[PDB]
Design a protein around this ligand. Structure first.
Ligand code: GTP
Ligand code: GTP
Ligand code: GDP
Ligand code: GDP
Ligand code: MG
Ligand code: MG
Lengths: 426, 428, 428, 426
């Protein structure tokens, strides 16, 4: 039916893609050998959205794995579900970006982008009608950031009428994993503002916070964070794969959530999330789902929505539920918290319901919010960038690869303009 | 002898049509596979030997909803080619339905409608089911109405539309679509029967004692309303009313053609045992604001025309007495330029009950269609929402990208202002 | 897939290389004869059937120390041609290593390095181990680094050098050699990791409770540090870091590339039983002045960039909490122009223990690489020693006789003054 | 790989050379027949530095014995280990110098120098890579002084790039063994300051003093003094023959110890030195060794180091030791006696450690000191020379051989210049 092409860039992108593909194969009843082993025919009716039928009732994911070093490729290939991926879809270089944005975008990325674009073009020509592309990557690295930026720009040049989704993790407020994070983040945001239809911002600190307070996990692992992210990715696209009462695909969400093209940065969320012990002390109903959804503790981005106002909200429900309860509850939450909703957009909430719930759970929901509190994250990244750029620290590493200072100035100006717009519509 | 063609557009239209055709097959004793072990001719064709195919068209720009039908229990009922599906949905965008995606499919649906009409000798008109806030259900139905009015012309066209609720709405850009589709379909429709999801939710909660109503219950109630409307064509009664009579009775002025529907009695099996559901009681209940299918206040408006369709064990004398008693009531007021404001229809067939349904089996039923000036309040509210959104130019680029111009928005706003002015003028 | 070349120059470099290669053979289960009963490919080649040869070059201008290797236990491990020896040492003279004796041998070592690089597909860079106060380890190291910069170019080059101690010196002419080699190798290096013998002596005396440490203990500790650095290349972990990231993260300006190394936890088997070696505790211990491997005061300077490499049973959340706890401490300060000053790497392989060693087996290990302005104090002390010695022209004739000019001494002093001025300017 | 040529001149030189070769042959496990009889292969790995392999696993020393009388040559031939020397290396005259510098340097030495130079040239051509030459002689005689001077000058003419070491016995302050000692000593010093790289000053009075107070020797003999001198000689070149932790050859010592070319006169010492009875009452540790080394009573030159300042100090340690203790104790002794160390040379001490200790001892160390107190000895010799030259005593003996008064004046001036320089840097 409607086809989605998946691309994974960098270490974090590859890991999250592997987790996402494991979750998806679990949903559709496919073992790591590519054969179908489910029971419900609903799992097979719309399997062409993510998988390709490759003779002998075997299914290969429609995914492209991209990196500049063979390490993560070998780790993903040798791990569980590493056999399903097509061998020709592994495009990897030998040098590596070394946490440098210019290397990923100008030096090595310019070398590998032709091959990755060839693979992407073949995959997109294979499908009868593609809905769009989705990419998982990071803004703090050098391979993921620059390479995903270049790939997004090239794809949008090739396919201007399709949807471009990105699930990118953003630098955290408290603790940084890289010294040169603000440079890469600022440049990546500069490019994503123009070349993307909708971006979902994920923060590692928020994921740790969720795993600690909500899931009660003593020793969380990157696997758990990837699990949560994959759950969100699966929840976003449920209406393209399963029947439901009120269906909303990617373009419906895009039309509903972004009023002005530059304001397309969202903070995702998922519900329900409970520990093992506390499972017995609640009943699965829509009210607890909306309570969990509309809560800063459950936000997957390190931004509190209560310092800003919601522009638009998407609530995608899965399971067998009553539409009357959902509509009444959305109306109630909108009325109770009218101060947190923009006044010149009535009915900030968009609703969609799918019949098939995730395996194991009777009911679930995914929350997408377009709030003005993202200006805080953008402001902090911009201020760190300005503080670093005042003294020209670490600048020669980027300048030696062909970058000019005008590029940094333009990226800073774009970040400032975006923050100004977000403040303006607040 | 006289036939009626039904068109179901979009998700809501297709699902309501599923409920309606289930109800029709139940009423006429036709199995879901089309075999029956002859007034049904107006709604079911006869092909070969003992196979009855509905006179319906199912259209949607996305395949999933109609795929559910093609793999459902009524798979063998419909002619496969009459179920037309697109490849990409309109994504709640009126421009996509009207220009970008509509032109690629409308020729096929027009061809199928022409083929269906060729098999009719006394075609009475068209019944189209659609939504206001939807993308395809707005744009494609507007384009289809233009093409139908161009082609067939004098044949009556009646809409069944889902109005957005004053406070309970799903999409964010619904006012844009509603205003645009109203402006586009004002000159091509004969009359539109109008319902609201919030009002039906309230009715299910209160009268039927249903804690958690779903879309199936709403579709069943709407199907009951449509069956009550069309029982005159599908059966024989003491005093029958056809499709053209609705148009010539309920529309005083060409632009004021938006009556709203009401059904009575709607009760569960618990309360039906302790009640004598006489003609007078149901006639009175039809006029209370708590029982209408559109969330609005008839007390703040004046009725212009009213149509009552009785079903079952009903005799004319009690109908006349109840109508007189309604006339003597001061709380409900009619416009002074309409001394005669009632249209009466009586049918012999009692309303059937779907097994597993929520309505109880009753001896009598009334479907009341009223043209009242109170819809001006809803029109004004929708216009205010449109103005609030259009002041900041929010979401305009989505519509402009697909082939729309801001001049269309201005024209739609001007036409809506003219329409509410006309309502306020006829009110006095 | 990606390979790394190790070069060991001088007595200290060769002996530290012996310790490092013993540690690698223990880590990957390779016997000393090259047989084992595949991430080790980055450090070991494969020739014939089940023989693994290191990708190493051992160079010295005198035969004794490398003759020990060619006679000792690891005689069969190394290829005969990659153990290059001269006949006459440099005798603690930079000029002899640079011009008189270095010129007769460098072509052979360059040929061997090229031969090694021809077998690599993803060569990441070079590690060179040498000394500052030595003759060959200064002059030949500078000559080799300049030749490598001319030949290979963009490939990263990382130094492991023994920094002369403030009060504990072996030679008399150490300041001359140190200043000259720093001046020569400033432009041809990417980053240099610094260690001090006196600091390691103090660490062994205090934490390891060792009364009489020898050079073997120091070499074992240095080998542990190097293994912690290269574990990301030789294994797979949650978050990995290769050679280029060190260079791009720890070097803010091209001339400021002298970070110092720190390892934790270093404890004997006696004290390990009464301690819970958590992530927070070792992270804190890495920042105390008494635990650093270079005798200097971090309290008197400001950090510029910090790199933490965890090994073993480590999960990222405790790392994040520990780094936040470090950041909230006022006692240690970062430069204001570096809001983000931490680079984090995590590996799954715990640190192994050499049989008969001095360290106890642990579940966790941290190797901290810090670039701080406190190195300016050591640079100033060395410059003062150079000035005092050069005022009287002591030992100058030894250097002049081998081909050096006093202009080189003046230029080296000027360059060192410029370097300390740059450090002071960056500090403010 | 590195080669050393040994020369013995005069009676004293021949005797100390014989003792030195006895000690060396004991160290390397060679019996007086020339065959190898040791156990450790370390004794054989670097045996080529001193010995030549002459077929049939027999080794001959690389030594040349020179004298102007057949007496001492016959004595060393007939004594123990006299057979190991090559018969062709015995170059001797018939006349003798008669304790006259002029005869040794101009009359008889001029005749014998051609043959001795031929022998030295053959030996040096035989070896592939020679480190340098060492000479054993005395400055109070006529054969040793003049002939060693002439040989040193000729060798430095032939081999200017090699190291020249001399172990010369200088006249003692208290009692003189020859009437004309100051003349020969002054001329020999005048030549040694120019034609040598490093000189080790040996005093018979100091050796008697050590043998008396330290070794508790009732009746010391010249053999015992030669034993001590041989111990020092063997301790100097240990790093060329055995492996160790920190290696220092002759050129390393020269670079570290002499800052200005004329200041190359050292005062050697050895430790441990204890009597038979007092051996039980002490422990062999590095503190004891460095205590013995830095002590005026243990010096082999009749000068008090506390009357001047140390320029540089070299300590060569033998045995299995901890480098931490060595470095710590050298730092401590430098700090405690900062008044006795030159201020404009930081870190005056140079250390070297060899693994193999001398036979019989677990630990040992050799001390070399370049102090300014040698100006006392030079001043005394110059004063005696001036006192004798004022009255022209015994001058006709030197003049009859063809020498001129200008040579005496030049030597006296050179001695004054040397003492002036030593006082200047003091
Ligand atoms: N009563 C009732 N209303 C429905 C039903 N399904 C959808 N709707 C209404 O339809 C409105 C949105 O339009 P949709 O029908 O969902 O979408 P569409 O008409 O197919 O147009 P597209 O967006 O292009 O798919 C919602 O506000 C609902 O109120 C239904 O089953 N019963
Ligand atoms: N940590 C450590 N340092 C050593 C070791 N060996 C020598 N050094 C240091 O090296 C410094 C002197 O340089 P060396 O390595 O001995 O001499 P070199 O580099 O070979 O140069 P040459 O003089 O020509 O032989 C000393 O100050 C020691 O601190 C060792 O095994 N471990
Ligand atoms: N959620 C998540 N984040 C990751 C993972 N691996 C790395 N990251 C983040 O990615 C950033 C490092 O960028 P990285 O992807 O390694 O650089 P790249 O190799 O150039 O793509 C760090 O800030 C991490 O927080 C992972 O497995 N899961
Ligand atoms: N240590 C030591 N000194 C000696 C020995 N024989 C002679 N001397 C010293 O050498 C001086 C005599 O010089 P001598 O070598 O005999 O004169 P030559 O024949 O011209 O070389 C005396 O002052 C002695 O102190 C000896 O066997 N050992
Ligand atoms: Mg739809
Ligand atoms: Mg050396």
């Amino acid at each position: 039916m409607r086809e989605i092409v998946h691309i994974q860039a960098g270490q974090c992108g590859n890991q999250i893609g592997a987790k996402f593909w494991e979750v998806i194969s679990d949903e559709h009843g496919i073992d790591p050998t590519g054969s179908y082993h489910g029971d419900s025919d609903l799992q097979l009716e719309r399997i062409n959205v993510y998988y390709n039928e490759a003779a002998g009732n075997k299914y290969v994911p429609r995914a492209i794995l991209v990196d500049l070093e063979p390490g993560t490729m070998d780790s993903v290939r040798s791990g569980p579900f590493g056999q399903i991926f097509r061998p020709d879809n592994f495009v990897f270089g030998q040098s590596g970006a070394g946490n440098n944005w210019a290397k990923g975008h100008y030096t090595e990325g310019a070398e590998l982008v032709d091959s990755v674009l060839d693979v992407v073009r073949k995959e997109s020509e294979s499908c009868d009608c593609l809905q769009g592309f989705q990419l998982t990557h990071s803004l703090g690295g050098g391979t993921g950031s620059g390479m995903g930026t270049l790939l997004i720009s090239k794809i949008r040049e090739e396919y201007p009428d399709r949807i471009m989704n990105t699930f990118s993790v953003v630098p955290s407020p408290k603790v940084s994993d890289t010294v040169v994070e603000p440079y890469n983040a600022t440049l990546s945001v500069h490019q994503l503002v123009e070349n993307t239809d909708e971006t979902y911002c994920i923060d590692n600190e928020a994921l740790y916070d969720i795993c600690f307070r909500t899931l009660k996990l003593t020793t969380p692992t990157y696997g758990d964070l990837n699990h949560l992210v994959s759950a969100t990715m699966s929840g976003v696209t449920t209406c393209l794969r399963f029947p439901g009462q009120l269906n909303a695909d990617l373009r419906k969400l895009a039309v509903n959530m972004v009023p002005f093209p530059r304001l397309h940065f969202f903070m995702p969320g998922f519900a329900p999330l409970t520990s093992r012990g506390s499972q017995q002390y609640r009943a699965l109903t829509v009210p607890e789902l909306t309570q969990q959804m509309f809560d800063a503790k459950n936000m997957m981005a390190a931004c509190d929505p209560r310092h800003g106002r919601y522009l638009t909200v998407a609530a995608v429900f899965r399971g067998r539920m009553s539409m009357k309860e959902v509509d009444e509850q959305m109306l109630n939450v909108q009325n109770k918290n009218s101060s947190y909703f923009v006044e010149w957009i009535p009915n900030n909430v968009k609703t969609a319901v799918c019949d098939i719930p995730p395996r194991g759970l009777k009911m679930s929901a995914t929350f997408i919010g377009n709030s003005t509190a993202i200006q805080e994250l953008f402001k902090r990244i911009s201020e760190q960038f300005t503080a670093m750029f005042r003294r020209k620290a670490f600048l020669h590493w980027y300048t030696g690869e062909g970058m000019d200072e005008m590029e940094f100035t333009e990226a800073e100006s774009n970040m400032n303009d975006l923050v100004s717009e977000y403040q303006q519509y607040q | 002898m006289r036939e009626c063609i039904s068109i179901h557009v979009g998700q809501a239209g297709v699902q309501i049509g599923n409920a309606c055709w289930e109800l029709y097959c139940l009423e006429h004793g036709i199995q879901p596979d089309g075999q029956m072990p002859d007034s049904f001719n107006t709604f079911f064709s006869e092909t070969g030997a003992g196979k009855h195919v509905p006179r319906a068209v199912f259209v949607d720009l996305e395949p999933t909803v109609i795929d559910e039908v093609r793999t459902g229990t009524y798979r063998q009922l419909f002619h496969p080619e009459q179920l037309i599906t697109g490849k990409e949905d309109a994504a709640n965008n009126y421009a996509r339905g009207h220009y970008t995606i509509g032109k690629e499919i409308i020729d096929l649906v027009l061809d199928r409608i022409r083929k269906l009409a060729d098999q009719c000798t006394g075609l009475q008109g068209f019944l189209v089911f659609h939504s206001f806030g939807g993308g395809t259900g707005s744009g494609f139905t507007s384009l289809l109405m233009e093409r139908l009015s161009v082609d067939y012309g004098k044949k009556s066209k009646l809409e069944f539309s889902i109005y957005p609720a004053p406070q309970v709405s799903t999409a964010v850009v619904e006012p844009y679509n509603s205003i645009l589709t109203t402006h586009t379909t004002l000159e091509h429709s004969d009359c539109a029967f109008m319902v609201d999801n919030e009002a039906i939710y309230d009715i299910c909660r209160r009268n039927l004692d249903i804690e958690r109503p779903t879309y199936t219950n709403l579709n069943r109630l709407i199907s009951q309303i449509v069956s009550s409307i069309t029982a005159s064509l599908r059966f024989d009664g003491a005093l029958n009313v056809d499709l053209t009579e609705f148009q010539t009775n309920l529309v005083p002025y060409p632009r004021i053609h938006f009556p709203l529907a009401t059904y009575a009695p709607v009760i569960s099996a618990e309360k039906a045992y302790h009640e004598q559901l006489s003609v007078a009681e149901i006639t009175n209940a039809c006029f209370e604001p708590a029982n209408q299918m559109v969330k609005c206040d008839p007390r703040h408006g004046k009725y212009m025309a009213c149509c009552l369709l009785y079903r079952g064990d009903v005799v004319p004398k009690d109908v006349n007495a109840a109508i007189a008693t309604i006339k003597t009531k001061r709380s409900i007021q009619f416009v002074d330029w309409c001394p005669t404001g009632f249209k009466v229809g009586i049918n012999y067939q009692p309303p059937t009950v779907v097994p597993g349904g929520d309505l109880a089996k009753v001896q009598r039923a009334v479907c009341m269609l009223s043209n009242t000036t109170a819809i001006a309040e809803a029109w004004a509210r929708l216009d205010h929402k449109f103005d609030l959104m259009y002041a900041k130019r929010a979401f305009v680029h989505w519509y402009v990208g697909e082939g729309m111009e801001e001049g269309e928005f201005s024209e739609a706003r001007e036409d809506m202002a003219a329409l509410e002015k006309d309502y306020e003028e006829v009110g006095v």
